[PDB]
Write a protein that binds this ligand. Structure first.
Ligand SMILES: Nc1nc2c(ncn2[C@@H]2O[C@H](COP(=O)(O)OP(=O)(O)NP(=O)(O)O)[C@@H](O)[C@H]2O)c(=O)[nH]1
Ligand SMILES: [Mg+2]
Ligand SMILES: [Mg+2]
Ligand SMILES: [Mg+2]
Ligand SMILES: [Mg+2]
Ligand SMILES: [Mg+2]
Ligand SMILES: [Mg+2]
Ligand SMILES: [Mg+2]
Ligand SMILES: [Mg+2]
Ligand SMILES: [Mg+2]
Ligand SMILES: [Mg+2]
Ligand SMILES: [Mg+2]
Ligand SMILES: [Mg+2]
Ligand SMILES: [Mg+2]
Ligand SMILES: [Mg+2]
Ligand SMILES: [Mg+2]
Ligand SMILES: [Mg+2]
Ligand SMILES: [Mg+2]
Ligand SMILES: [Mg+2]
Ligand SMILES: [Mg+2]
Ligand SMILES: [Mg+2]
Ligand SMILES: [Mg+2]
Ligand SMILES: [Mg+2]
Ligand SMILES: [Mg+2]
Ligand SMILES: [Mg+2]
Ligand SMILES: [Mg+2]
Ligand SMILES: [Mg+2]
Ligand SMILES: [Mg+2]
Ligand SMILES: [Mg+2]
Ligand SMILES: [Mg+2]
Ligand SMILES: [Mg+2]
Ligand SMILES: [Mg+2]
Ligand SMILES: [Mg+2]
Ligand SMILES: [Mg+2]
Ligand SMILES: [Mg+2]
Ligand SMILES: [Mg+2]
Ligand SMILES: [Mg+2]
Ligand SMILES: [Mg+2]
Ligand SMILES: [Mg+2]
Lengths: 262, 82, 131, 85, 123, 205
RNA sequence: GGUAGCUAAUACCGCAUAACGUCGCAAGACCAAAGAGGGGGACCUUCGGGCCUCUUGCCAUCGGAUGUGCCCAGAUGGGAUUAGCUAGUAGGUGGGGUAACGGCUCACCUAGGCGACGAUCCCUAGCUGGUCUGAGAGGAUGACCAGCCACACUGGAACUGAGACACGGUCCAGACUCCUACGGGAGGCAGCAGUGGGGAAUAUUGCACAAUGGGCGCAAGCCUGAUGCAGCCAUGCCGCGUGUAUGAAGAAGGCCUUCGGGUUGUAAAGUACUUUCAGCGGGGAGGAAGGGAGUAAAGUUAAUACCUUUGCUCAUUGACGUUACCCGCAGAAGAAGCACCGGCUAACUCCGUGCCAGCAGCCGCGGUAAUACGGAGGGUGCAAGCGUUAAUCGGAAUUACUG
């Protein structure tokens, strides 16, 4: 309780967050949140996802209209969660410094800035790239969605992300650090009664997920397609055997990154 | 309570209402007592656009039948004796 | 002192970090009874202090082993409205914790006085000075 | 069930109550007659009948012994009270 | 014969039975497949035909042909049985769909790749 | 939905000039017409009663640019319509705007007659028409886009149009670049290597 | 929620008054109701408003229209390896009952009622208009649309009310589930959308009441996942484009060749040409009718107020919506796949392989030149589809009434 007294006494009220536009004061009106997390959504009766947003400035109110800066599409809000301790709660209206929940349907990512209009994006949020291994090949001898559905639902979350090549089967997953266990465990918890195990897979990279101008890409999506994959979220990626075979791939050139984006 | 209203039997974007006598308690396109004219909210400036058995309409009204606010705006929009 | 800038100033949103098995989740459960959110309390793994009261480690596997991903909390203490995070200890496991720091204006580090400063304690300070 | 016109319930309930007894006295009155009939006193019979005659015609006008339901009662009563008296 | 007869016992059609009745009369079904063997065809033709016994979704267990050369199938697997018989292997009334569920299509196959389930080999 | 390929390759299999390379000089030739529609073109195809029965209509299709799904429909029409389905079907085939175009020589072949109608370069009794399938009633009057009128292409088209069989059911011009559809083509005023009891025969089982 | 008390109404109840109504052959008995508004000359009394008036509402009786009950007949799946079924059962008399006939109920009385024209009993199944097939007769079927019916967690019951035996009402019981401070409470997506689950497989937790239509209201208006739109999916039907012309002894390359050549093939190149549709940019119908404010009407009135009415004037009324559609800019630019080629069956050769590998709808291909396997060339057929599978009618005069 002292450290709490100390907490209340000394610790900052909502702080300014930086953006590629300006120092955003907490004092301002005009709503300005930024997600930051799409928690390991189980969740008792839904895919939900419910993206966790920070609220930098402005007051949120249930029926208000907001703007997803990234996709540049204006969105009306209604069901906007307030988390009473690892538990969804309906729902109120929020002030700077709180944490608000939404409802991810491939619309939200990580670092997705939401304003009331001001087109700008918060310079924060880390988002780094995975290492690898895997091939969940499942006991339960299938199905097949619930496993996959399970995987393409733990993947619009930030931890891991799957990789499904162009051979329907052969499911690859990659790969926070090495705790590929929550996957197995959420493969028989959350809402999927699958079981699943592992193997070793000839994949160093990771990969890195590409796109730019047409035609050239269709020649790329063809030549080194062996070899090329597609993700939960319907794009994109390669999947290489080593570092040399990674360099030569990009070296096919000159069409784009690198790209990780979680 | 017998009323004379319109049923939406047109098509996406291009409606085609149809005046009819029917117990109010019914579905728009539901059980009706009898067709009694139509109304084309399109048609364009050409040869036609509406039709009413006004001499039947008046028959039904004479039996205690209400009219749609829009059905009315037809009846008399097409005059009556000219 | 308008009803807007008043609500803003009385808020306070923070982390809770440390090295795996330090006290995050426990000190959190205790902070929750100082906020009248939990009328009793519990432990971890639902262990040594009996009663099906663990708790507030969201998930499931957490309650089987020990902690997984940031639970988030809002409660009133004294004259304030606290927003509380619960950051996972483990190298490979998070990530997340880092991204969670992006939502906090300040941060509380728990240290095992039986252990002193451990590895991810040192690594967490580096991440802290970033902001 | 969380839907405003659950007052429609407590409302109906009130009426139920009200009706019940109205309807309840309704019959008990008619009864007196049948009694007089299974008892024989034809004077006492018209006696009861006259006092019920109105109290029935009334509840119909109010709408609980509807329409000819009263007619029936008054009718098939008059039909017996003097069938043998 | 007689009309009066027909009036009596009236003529009755002969209902039909599908050569493939592992149920629902539905386009295909999914099954776990219990064994992957090969056997030998009827009198005239000779070879080692590829077949698989398959526990179906509807509970019927039933053997099925594996068309094309070579397949990935084995121990457990999951496939999508199709229908159409195989007159060389009697008791084999179904074909597992190549290139569906746990089934690999034919490696390098370039003609009528639709069947045998293979994707354009990069034009 | 269009053919899009070796137009002569076709005329060699149907063994007739299908008017696919009309343009400047016509009357096939300069392509080995007949004797090699493929790799074995030399062969002497003794084709079945079906063979011809098909080859007939399968020709007619080509010589207009119509496909099956649509052709099938066309037949259904003529059968429902009273009178020799044979000629009826032809009457529908001739009634095509793409046809009333090339027919009125506003384009080289009927493969060029579409590029225009398809590219809003003609009209009917006024309003522009984009569907290279419009059914041209009687008294209708198609007319090259008043806008894009007389161009490097269509100009040279009228040229040989005037030096062709020249119809009888339509009245063309050259400067007003508009014709009328005066009456539906009779059986007598059109033909060639085309049999009806062969194409209608086909659609019967 | 529980006790006590205070208060209004078009809530509730007598009384009065009653016929063209109910009872009664007649005589005579007996029954109803509500007020609230916008105003306004008199006079105005206890100047609340009484009063005049139009407007809306109440009662009673007889009608109209609608809606619903109730009745009879014929017809409406299979099974005789289901041949008998039935005590309120069949009818009568008499009370009661219902809105109404009735076994609907009960009392007593006859001993009946149904059934091979298939009762009973099993199995299946919502019925129809229709739908697919068929030359027809028929066979198959009843998603979407409209009529009828039935159910709304399972079973049961009544209440309220014109109408329910009530999806988002009530009571009881049953199974389940949720909250609980432990004493007690709460709920039913076969409404929209959405999750789980099952399956070869079936959609977004979208927008709006602007139009049509419904409930309340004098009216504005309010409510309306009905409706109107949108999103997703080639699932289909219907349109359309992926270029149009011209082009050589006819390139390279690929393919066959008795090597002389044939063929892919006007195909490509090259040369001219056109830009629908997409992409960017502009302009912009219809779905809009009504309502909201002022003016006139032998409208009624004591009245130019109020109300209604019909013309008139002004401001205004949309979800789709960066609408449909129109016009420019650019450049062949961005858009072809799939099955098939021994016979039925349109469409052929080389090579490999060798009764292996494998095809196959049926016949049948494969053990050394495979038009049948696999690859390649070429060819045929459909085309944003093409194929396989599944299922129905046809071919099947193969349940034949036609036949
Ligand atoms: N003796 C003692 N043990 C304590 C104390 N606080 C926490 N612990 C122990 O620390 C163990 C870890 O508890 P927990 O709160 O999960 O630690 P953590 O820091 O949250 N772990 P993680 O880093 O995985 O999230 C608990 O099981 C508890 O028994 C304390 O004050 N005293
Ligand atoms: Mg912990
Ligand atoms: Mg009310
Ligand atoms: Mg009686
Ligand atoms: Mg089957
Ligand atoms: Mg053999
Ligand atoms: Mg095969
Ligand atoms: Mg055998
Ligand atoms: Mg080939
Ligand atoms: Mg088409
Ligand atoms: Mg029947
Ligand atoms: Mg029977
Ligand atoms: Mg049923
Ligand atoms: Mg026949
Ligand atoms: Mg039927
Ligand atoms: Mg349905
Ligand atoms: Mg209800
Ligand atoms: Mg419900
Ligand atoms: Mg639903
Ligand atoms: Mg759904
Ligand atoms: Mg509306
Ligand atoms: Mg509401
Ligand atoms: Mg709504
Ligand atoms: Mg050569
Ligand atoms: Mg365009
Ligand atoms: Mg308009
Ligand atoms: Mg108009
Ligand atoms: Mg009016
Ligand atoms: Mg607007
Ligand atoms: Mg525009
Ligand atoms: Mg091609
Ligand atoms: Mg074919
Ligand atoms: Mg054929
Ligand atoms: Mg042939
Ligand atoms: Mg083959
Ligand atoms: Mg077949
Ligand atoms: Mg050979
Ligand atoms: Mg071959
Ligand atoms: Mg037959």
């Amino acid at each position: 309780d002292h450290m709490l007294d100390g907490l209340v006494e000394w610790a900052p009220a909502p702080m300014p967050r930086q953006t590629d536009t300006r120092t955003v004061e907490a004092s301002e009106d005009k709503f300005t949140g930024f997600v930051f997390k799409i928690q390991a959504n189980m969740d008792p009766k839904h895919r939900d996802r419910v993206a966790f947003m920070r609220v930098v400035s402005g007051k949120y109110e249930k029926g208000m209209k907001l703007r997803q800066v990234r996709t540049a599409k204006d969105v009306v809000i209604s069901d906007a969660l307030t988390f009473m301790a690892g538990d969804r709660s309906h729902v109120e209206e929020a002030y700077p410094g709180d944490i608000l929940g939404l409802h991810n349907h491939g619309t939200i990512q990580i670092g997705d800035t939401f304003t009331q209009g001001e087109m700008m994006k918060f310079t924060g949020i880390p988002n780094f790239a995975p290492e690898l291994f895997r091939r969940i090949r499942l006991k339960d001898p299938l199905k097949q969605k619930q496993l996959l559905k399970g995987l393409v639902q733990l993947s619009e979350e930030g931890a891991v992300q799957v990789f499904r090549p162009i051979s329907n089967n052969d499911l690859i997953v990659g790969a926070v650090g090495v705790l590929q266990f929550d996957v197995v465990v959420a493969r028989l918890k959350s809402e999927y009664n699958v079981e699943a195990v592992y193997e070793s897979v000839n994949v160093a990279t990771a990969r890195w997920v590409e796109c730019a101008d047409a035609k050239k890409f269709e020649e790329f999506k063809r030549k080194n397609e062996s070899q090329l994959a597609l993700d939960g979220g319907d794009n994109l990626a390669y999947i290489a055997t080593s570092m040399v075979n990674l360099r030569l791939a990009q070296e096919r050139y000159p069409d784009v990154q690198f790209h990780q984006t979680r | 309570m017998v009323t004379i209203r319109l049923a939406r039997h047109g098509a996406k974007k291009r409606p085609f209402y149809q005046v009819v006598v029917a117990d109010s308690r019914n579905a728009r396109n539901g059980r009706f007592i009898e067709r009694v004219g139509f109304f084309n909210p399109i048609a364009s400036e050409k040869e036609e656009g509406t039709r009413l058995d006004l001499d039947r309409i008046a028959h039904w009204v004479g039996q205690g039948a209400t009219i749609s606010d829009r059905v009315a705006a037809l009846i008399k929009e097409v005059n009556k004796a000219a | 002192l308008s009803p807007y800038l008043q609500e803003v100033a009385k808020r306070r949103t923070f982390a809770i970090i440390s090295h795996p098995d330090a006290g995050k989740t426990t000190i959190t459960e205790k902070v929750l009874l100082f906020g009248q959110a939990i009328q009793t309390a519990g432990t971890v793994k639902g262990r040594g202090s009996n009663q099906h009261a663990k708790s507030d480690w969201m998930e499931m596997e957490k309650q089987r082993g020990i902690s997984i991903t940031t639970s988030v909390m809002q409660f009133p203490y004294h004259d304030c409205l606290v927003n509380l995070l619960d950051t996972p200890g483990h190298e490979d496991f998070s990530e997340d914790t880092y991204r969670t720091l992006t939502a906090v204006d300040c941060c509380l580090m728990v240290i095992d006085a039986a252990k002193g400063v451990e590895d991810r304690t040192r690594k967490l300070m580096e991440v802290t000075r970033l902001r | 069930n969380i839907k405003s016109a659950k007052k429609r319930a407590i409302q109906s309930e009130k009426a139920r109550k009200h009706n019940a007894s109205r309807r309840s006295m309704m019959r008990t009155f008619i009864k007196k007659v049948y009694a007089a009939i299974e008892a024989g006193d034809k004077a006492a019979a018209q006696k009861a009948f006259n006092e019920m005659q109105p109290i029935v015609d009334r509840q119909a006008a109010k709408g609980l012994i509807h329409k000819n339901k009263a007619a029936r009662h008054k009718a098939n009563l008059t039909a017996q009270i003097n069938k043998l008296a | 014969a007689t009309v009066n007869q027909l009036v009596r016992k009236p003529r009755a059609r002969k209902v039909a039975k599908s050569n493939v009745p592992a149920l629902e009369a539905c386009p295909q079904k999914r099954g776990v497949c219990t064994r992957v063997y090969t056997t030998t065809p009827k009198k005239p033709n000779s070879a080692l035909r590829k077949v698989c016994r398959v526990r179906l979704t509807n509970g019927f267990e039933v053997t099925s042909y594996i068309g094309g050369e070579g397949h990935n199938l084995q121990e457990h697997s999951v496939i999508l049985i199709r229908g159409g018989r195989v007159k060389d292997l009697p008791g084999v009334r179904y074909h597992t769909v190549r290139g569906a569920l746990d089934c690999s299509g034919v490696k390098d196959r370039k003609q009528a790749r639709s069947k045998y389930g293979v994707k354009r080999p990069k034009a | 939905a269009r053919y899009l390929g070796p137009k002569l390759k076709l005329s060699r299999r149907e063994g007739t000039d299908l008017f696919l390379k009309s343009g400047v000089r016509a009357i096939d030739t300069k392509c080995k017409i007949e004797q090699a529609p493929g790799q074995h073109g030399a062969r002497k195809p003794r084709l079945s009663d079906y063979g011809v029965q098909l080859r007939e209509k399968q020709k007619v299709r080509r010589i207009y640019g119509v496909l099956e799904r649509q052709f099938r429909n066309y037949y259904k029409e003529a059968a429902r319509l009273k009178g020799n389905t044979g000629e009826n079907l032809l009457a529908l085939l001739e009634g095509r705007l793409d046809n009333v175009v090339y027919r009125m020589g506003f384009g080289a072949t009927r493969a060029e007659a579409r590029q225009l109608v398809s590219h809003k370069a003609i009209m009917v009794n006024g309003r522009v028409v984009n569907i290279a399938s419009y059914q041209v009633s009687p008294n209708d009057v198609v007319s090259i886009r008043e806008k894009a009128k007389k161009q490097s292409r269509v100009k040279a088209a009228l040229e040989l149009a005037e030096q062709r069989e020249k119809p009888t059911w339509l009245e063309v011009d050259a400067g007003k670049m508009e014709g009328t559809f005066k009456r539906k083509p009779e059986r007598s005023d059109l033909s060639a290597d085309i049999n009806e009891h062969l194409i209608v025969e086909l659609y019967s089982k």
